Design a protein around this ligand. Structure first.
Ligand SMILES: Cc1ccc(C2CC2)cc1C(=O)/C=C(\O)C(=O)O
Ligand SMILES: [Mg+2]
Ligand SMILES: [Mg+2]
Length: 712
């Protein structure tokens, strides 16, 4: 064929060659021993992987039946709770404990700041994301709606000085709020100098230093007239660039050219919900980019070097120039035919990701032909998504342990960022953390997947509230607080990240700056952003909120009950008028179609899709999971008919065709000839039958179908 036999496995040649020629050289792992290890790990752990997936199905069957066999008024919470305990869904809560994870980098244990997620299959985006550790505040302010485009302040083809002056003024207020002067305001500064190791800021009438001189972290250039001044606040760096000859510095009262913020402290290179990878060719593209990131030679533009500074006293030092990288592996569900066994059965994809992304990450622990690219403390950081409960966490740990043995790595090298994005994890979160107590480096509320699981788990209970109502429902507010509580109770402060979820409105940056501050105010040491620009703007929130102090104030508090976590988001009687149902259907169909068409026809796993209100939303599989499950639920309970669904899909499809484009194939009017349209339809009409409402089985099948037809 086009496969390589190793034991019981038949490996796609493209993957075999990539591993031997690109991934293995430089790790000192023997190629034959590696492939024997792949065979042995797959054979040994596949049964447990399948058993865990079977357990999800059996628990969900019981829950479906339970709802179908009830007539009572609102749900008897006491009966529901004891039922879930009976079936093993709700497990006992373990005694208090503190995590023991060691060898973790400061960016994770100590620094509070933004965490950027990027599809690993897009080399250009991945490079920008790794370089997003530092970003221009002026560019982020000028280029977005944070500075309103009011009369006279609009963006044009050329620089608008009125707008630029608003940018400068915004940044000066940020400096006053973050690194205050002893007296006066940065808005009146006329220059900066370093005198006896102290920062001196010239005012019109006088000179002043910092109210806290310890916030002066360094400078570049001559101490007499530095080319830049480096400050620190809440552990994050701020750099004032001084250049009176620049276009902006010429207009500035102190010659300031820009303010650079330490922004994306860590970055998650994603193999999961933001990428479309359905075969060996796709996986190799992703693995090769992850390899180039860890070897430091990925080029599309290149990775940045570390940044050199002079210390206040005069010594030299350096700061990391790149975001510390995690990789998000796929979860336990899917198989991939990149490897098949002798029976033709596909191998579990999460098992493969652990082996291959783990192998590749070794390069980030060693010098790059300069210094090693990633973890100086010797860890490999893997986000494991979509786990359901503590036995599934234990399985990830065993998989990582077995992979470490194959790779010759110390035990516990491979650390786990746990997504809390499935109900059976939420309600057993303390036990999930305990199961990974020596590997865990974060917990994070993946609230979009979590909403998808909320809908599917209770699918039989009745019609759910509209998608937009979900973000304010009791269950989700309890879930967010419960996650923070569990992390802090497990000793996460100073040891691991407590993270919150993604901002998806990529153009609504004024709204992000106004509202996303709630996440660090809730004690999250990190939260997810969709772009380098949004990382720079979200960094402002960490200068305003002292997350370390917030976490200390939250200690010992139990702010969510199990009853709150289990409050199902059922709609009340007579909740909606016909126009509101119409808008919900059309909005969900447009978002489904806009995302699925680029997935199936172009293999793009994350797309900006305008919604029914013309708001650009960054869509990935989790937002698709919500929209498809909600419509499945409304169809299941008679809120809408199958004619309503088909009509909405047919009405929104031509609009999506218009929004798109070199490789774009219109879906309309030949709907049944478009694999993408049929995939969108199947996601709704078959949604109730998909395991835990997951979208990958349909998406993968339909993308492979598209590729097959295109190859003739
Ligand atoms: C929803 C979403 C949008 C965009 C991106 C990336 C930037 C492309 C990631 C996610 C995501 O995966 C979130 C969660 O895992 C989860 O809330 O379930
Ligand atoms: Mg998710
Ligand atoms: Mg403070």
């Amino acid at each position: 064929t086009d496969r390589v036999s190793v034991g019981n496995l038949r490996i796609a040649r493209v993957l075999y060659d990539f591993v031997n020629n690109e991934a293995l050289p430089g790790t000192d792992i023997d190629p034959d021993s590696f492939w024997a290890g792949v065979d042995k790990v797959v054979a040994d752990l596949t049964p447990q992987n399948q058993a865990l997936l079977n357990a999800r199905d059996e628990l969900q069957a019981q829950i479906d039946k339970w709802h179908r066999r009830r007539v009572i008024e609102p749900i008897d919470m006491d009966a529901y709770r004891q039922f879930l305990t009976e079936i093993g869904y709700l497990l006992p809560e373990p005694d208090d404990f503190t995590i023991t994870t060691s060898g973790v980098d400061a960016e994770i244990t100590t620094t509070a700041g933004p965490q950027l997620v990027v599809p690993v299959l897009n080399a250009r985006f991945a490079l920008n994301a790794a370089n997003a550790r530092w970003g221009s505040l002026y560019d982020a302010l000028y280029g977005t709606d944070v500075i309103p485009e009011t009369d006279g302040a609009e963006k044009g083809p050329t620089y608008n000085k009125v707008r630029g002056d608003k940018v400068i003024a915004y940044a000066r207020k940020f400096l006053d709020d973050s690194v205050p002067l002893s007296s006066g305001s940065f808005g009146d500064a006329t220059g900066f100098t370093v005198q006896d190791g102290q920062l001196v800021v010239a005012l019109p009438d006088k000179s002043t230093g910092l109210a806290n001189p310890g916030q002066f972290a360094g400078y570049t250039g001559a101490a007499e007239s530095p080319t830049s001044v480096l400050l620190i606040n809440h552990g994050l760096h701020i750099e004032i660039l001084i250049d009176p000859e620049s276009q902006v510095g010429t207009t500035d009262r102190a010659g300031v050219k820009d303010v650079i913020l330490e922004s994306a402290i860590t970055t998650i290179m994603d193999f999961e919900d933001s990428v479309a990878a359905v075969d060996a060719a796709d996986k190799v593209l992703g693995y090769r980019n992850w390899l180039g990131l860890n070897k430091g030679d990925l080029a599309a533009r290149v990775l940045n070097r570390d940044r050199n500074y002079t210390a206040p006293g005069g010594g030299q030092f350096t700061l990391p120039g790149r975001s510390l990288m995690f990789v998000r592996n796929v979860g336990h569900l899917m198989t991939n035919d990149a490897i098949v066994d002798t029976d033709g059965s596909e191998v579990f994809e999460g098992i493969m990701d652990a082996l291959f992304t783990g192998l590749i990450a070794i390069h980030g622990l060693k010098a790059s032909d300069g210094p090693l690219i990633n973890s100086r403390t010797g860890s490999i950081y893997i986000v494991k998504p979509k786990m359901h409960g503590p036995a599934e966490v234990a399985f990830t740990c065993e998989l990582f342990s077995r992979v470490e043995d194959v790779l010759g790595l110390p035990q516990n090298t491979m650390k786990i960022g746990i997504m809390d994005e499935e109900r059976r994890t939420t309600v057993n979160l303390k036990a999930c953390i305990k199961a990974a107590a020596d590997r865990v480096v974060f917990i994070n509320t993946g609230f979009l997947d979590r909403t998808g699981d909320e809908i599917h788990t209770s699918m039989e209970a009745g019609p759910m509230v509209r998608k937009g109502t979900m973000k304010s429902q009791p269950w989700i507010l309890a879930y967010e607080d419960h996650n923070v509580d569990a992390g802090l109770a497990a000793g996460f402060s100073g040891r691991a990240q407590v993270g919150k979820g993604m901002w998806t409105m990529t153009e609504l940056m004024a709204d992000m700056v106004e509202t996303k501050i709630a996440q660090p105010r809730a004690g999250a040491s990190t939260a997810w952003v969709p772009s380098p620009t949004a990382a720079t703007l979200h960094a402002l929130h960490y200068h305003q909120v002292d997350v370390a102090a917030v976490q200390q104030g939250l200690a010992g508090k139990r702010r969510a009950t199990i009853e709150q976590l289990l409050t199902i988001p059922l709609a009340k009687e007579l909740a909606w008028a016909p126009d509101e149902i119409r808008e919900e259907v059309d909005n969900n169909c447009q978002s489904i179609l806009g995302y699925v068409v680029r997935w199936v026809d172009q293999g793009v796993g994350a797309s900006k899709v305008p919604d029914i209100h013309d708001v650009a939303l960054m869509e990935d599989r989790a937002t698709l999971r919500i929209s498809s499950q909600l419509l499945a639920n409304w169809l299941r309970h008679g809120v809408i008919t199958s004619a309503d669904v088909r009509a909405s899909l047919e009405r929104m499809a031509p609009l999506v065709d218009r929004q798109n484009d070199v490789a774009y194939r219109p879906m309309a009017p030949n709907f049944d000839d478009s694999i993408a349209f049929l995939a969108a339809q199947e996601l709704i009409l078959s949604g109730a039958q998909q395991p835990n409402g997951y979208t990958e089985p349909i998406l993968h099948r339909r993308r492979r179908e598209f590729k097959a037809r295109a190859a003739e």
